[PDB]
Automatic annotation (TrEMBL), chain A:
Location relative to the cell: Mitochondrion inner membrane
Lineage top rank: taxon: Eukaryota
Subunit structure, interactors included: Complex I is composed of 45 different subunits. Interacts with CARD15, but not with CARD4. Interacts with STAT3, but not with STAT1, STAT2 and STAT5A. Interacts with OLFM4.
Function: Complex I functions in the transfer of electrons from NADH to the respiratory chain. Accessory subunit of the mitochondrial membrane respiratory chain NADH dehydrogenase (Complex I), that is believed not to be involved in catalysis. Accessory subunit of the mitochondrial membrane respiratory chain NADH dehydrogenase (Complex I), that is believed not to be involved in catalysis. Complex I functions in the transfer of electrons from NADH to the respiratory chain. The immediate electron acceptor for the enzyme is believed to be ubiquinone. Involved in the interferon/all-trans-retinoic acid (IFN/RA) induced cell death. This apoptotic activity is inhibited by interaction with viral IRF1. Prevents the transactivation of STAT3 target genes.
UniProt similarity note: Belongs to the complex I NDUFA13 subunit family.
Name assigned to this protein: NADH dehydrogenase [ubiquinone] 1 alpha subcomplex subunit 13
Transmembrane segments: 28-48
Length: 71, 318
């Protein structure tokens, strides 16, 4: 006596279902990456230049200590 | 007292390898939307012990066609060399202080490949032979580029002494001066430890088990321990070479902690890389190393020879 009941889609329809490819760009330019790399290299070069010059001075100092102690 | 130090080196390395197996399983599980071992002990902390006990209580078998002496010798050589690779590493003091530590590690690494070659040949099986020939190809691919990269990086150090790398990086990491060489060295160490995407010798999808297919039980376990110890050692060496931790002579534990975190991060980076990528073809690996890595390596070797002279920054200690 009751209404026919069955598994049916809701009145209207269903919400849209996405299927298309979605790969966002999500990246920097090539120039920016290359510039960051070159700047990092230059900073490291300058720091290591100072450090190695100081190390050469220290090495000369201890070599002179040896020279003084040798006789 | 020196044997005490040898043991205090080797035994914790074996424990670290045992738990690195579990760390790998859990990390690759979580990157794959699962958990990994969490039943055998809390959070799977007892899994490596169960694995070792199962492996060393299982029957080892001699193949009928195998050459017995080389078959037994190869895992012994592998494990002994893996343990030996750790003695010159300064953490911050090395067990063995060498004038030439880097080149010693190079020679021992070159010798380590013969364990794979001899196991594959002495197994007297087709898949093991294919694995051994792939190992020959891999070494031919990576050896020269790796050595020249070491040369170029160490040109700024002034010697081949591993402990000098701490002094060289007192103010800045070496990576900030040689990051292209750092990337190429990282890929070369990935290839050198037979790790994905360069895990050609085992070749599980293609060769079933490759060079170690015949091996079972305890001998198989030693090959596994040797490989994982080599992974940890290579990551520690990379950390020393490119990420210099500040060392206080009156407090070396700070350097030890900093070193351990950096090498753990590099090992986890290997694990991530394995979880992320497919496998190379073993001719493509040689083409990559000989057509892309080798030219840049030669050019950067020239550049790193010229740079200290141009900027008057030659390091001391001839
Ligand atoms: C002076 C004399 C020189 C002494 C040699 C040293 C001792 C090796 C002799 C014992 C091995 C042979 C036993 C055997 O045949 O089956 C065993 C036995 C019989 O099996 P079977 O099925 O009944 O019969 C098999 C067939 O008879 C045949 O089966 P097969 O196909 O296996 O036969 C081949 C085997 C048969 O051997 C022979 O033909 C005669 C032995 C003479 C070999 C000497 C040649 C020179 C090689 C170079 C010099 C090496 C150093 C020697 C100097 C000593 C001072 C250190 O030859 C070998 O493979 C031995 C090679 C030894 C070199 C190992 C060095 C490792 C190199 C690591 C890198 C090096 C870094 C730089 C340094 O099976 C077992 O008991 C299980 C395996 C036991 C083997 C243990 C490991 C091998 C010995 C260790 C080598 C020493 C390292 C230090
Ligand atoms: C995609 O599937 C796969 C995985 O994913 C699930 C893996 O993990 C995987 C790697 C293999 C795992 C199953 C790890 C296996 C664990 C080892 C074989 C156990 C080794 C542990 C011992 C041998 C080390 C020694 C034990 C001691 C406690 C160390 C101390 C030594 C004393 C002297 C002190 C493979 C190959 C795989 O194919
Ligand atoms: C415990 C009693 C010890 C007896 C030792 C006998 C060794 C032996 O040859 O026996 C073979 C034995 C067991 O086989 P089965 O007899 O079939 O089964 C036994 C159970 N019933 O096989 C083995 O375990 C051989 C183990 C190798 C012995 C160790 C010596 C090898 C030395 C290697 C040197 C190479 C070094 C390379 C690296 C160094 C380079 C810097
Ligand atoms: C195996 C390959 C052997 C290579 C061993 C290299 C070890 C090493 O480099 O240590 C160097 C160290 C110190 O050198 P420096 O850097 O100048 O510092 C100290 C000076 N103040 O030199 C040493 O201690 C020499 C010790 C003796 C050399 C060891 C020889 C090993 C040869 C292996 C033979 C194997 C056993 C015999 C049979 C083999 C096969 C059965």
């Amino acid at each position: 006596a009751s209404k026919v009941k069955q598994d049916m889609p809701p009145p209207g329809g269903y919400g849209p279902i996405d299927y298309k490819r979605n790969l966002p760009r999500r990246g920097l330019s090539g120039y920016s990456m290359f510039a960051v790399g070159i700047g990092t290299l230059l900073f490291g070069y300058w720091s290591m230049m100072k450090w190695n010059r100081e190390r050469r001075r220290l090495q000369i100092e201890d070599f002179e200590a040896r020279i003084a102690l040798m006789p | 007292m020196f044997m005490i130090n040898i043991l205090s080196l080797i035994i914790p390395i074996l424990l670290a390898v045992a738990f690195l197996t579990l760390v790998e399983r859990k990390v690759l599980g979580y990157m794959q939307l699962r958990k990994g071992p969490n039943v055998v002990g809390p959070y799977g902390l007892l899994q490596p012990i169960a694995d070792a006990l199962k492996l060393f209580t299982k029957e080892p078998l001699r193949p009928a066609t195998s050459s017995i002496s080389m078959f037994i010798i190869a895992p012994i050589l592998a494990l002994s060399l893996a343990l030996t690779m750790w003695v010159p590493l300064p953490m911050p003091y090395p067990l063995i202080n060498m004038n030439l530590g880097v080149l010693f590690m190079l020679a021992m690494s070159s010798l380590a490949v013969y364990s794979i070659l001899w196991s594959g040949w002495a197994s007297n099986s087709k898949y093991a032979l294919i694995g051994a020939l792939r190992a020959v190809a891999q070494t031919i691919s990576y050896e020269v580029t790796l050595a020249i990269i070491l040369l170029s990086v160490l040109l700024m150090n002034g010697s081949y002494t591993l402990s000098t790398l701490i002094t060289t990086q007192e103010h800045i990491w070496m990576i900030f001066t040689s990051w292209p060489l750092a990337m190429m060295w990282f890929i070369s160490t990935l290839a050198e430890t037979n790790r994905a995407p360069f895990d050609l010798t085992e070749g599980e999808s293609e060769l079933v088990s490759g060079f170690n297919v015949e091996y079972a039980a305890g001998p198989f376990a030693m090959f596994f321990m040797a490989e994982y110890a080599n992974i940890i050692m290579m990551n520690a060496f990379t950390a020393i070479l490119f990420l210099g931790a500040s060392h206080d002579p009156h407090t070396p534990e700070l350097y030890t902690i900093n070193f351990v975190l950096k090498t753990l991060a590099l090992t986890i980076t290997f694990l991530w890389i394995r979880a992320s990528y497919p496998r190379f073809r073993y001719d493509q690996l040689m083409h990559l190393l000989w057509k892309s890595f080798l030219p840049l390596t030669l050019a950067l070797c020239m550049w790193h020879i010229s740079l200290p002279i141009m900027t008057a920054s030659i390091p001391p200690q001839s």
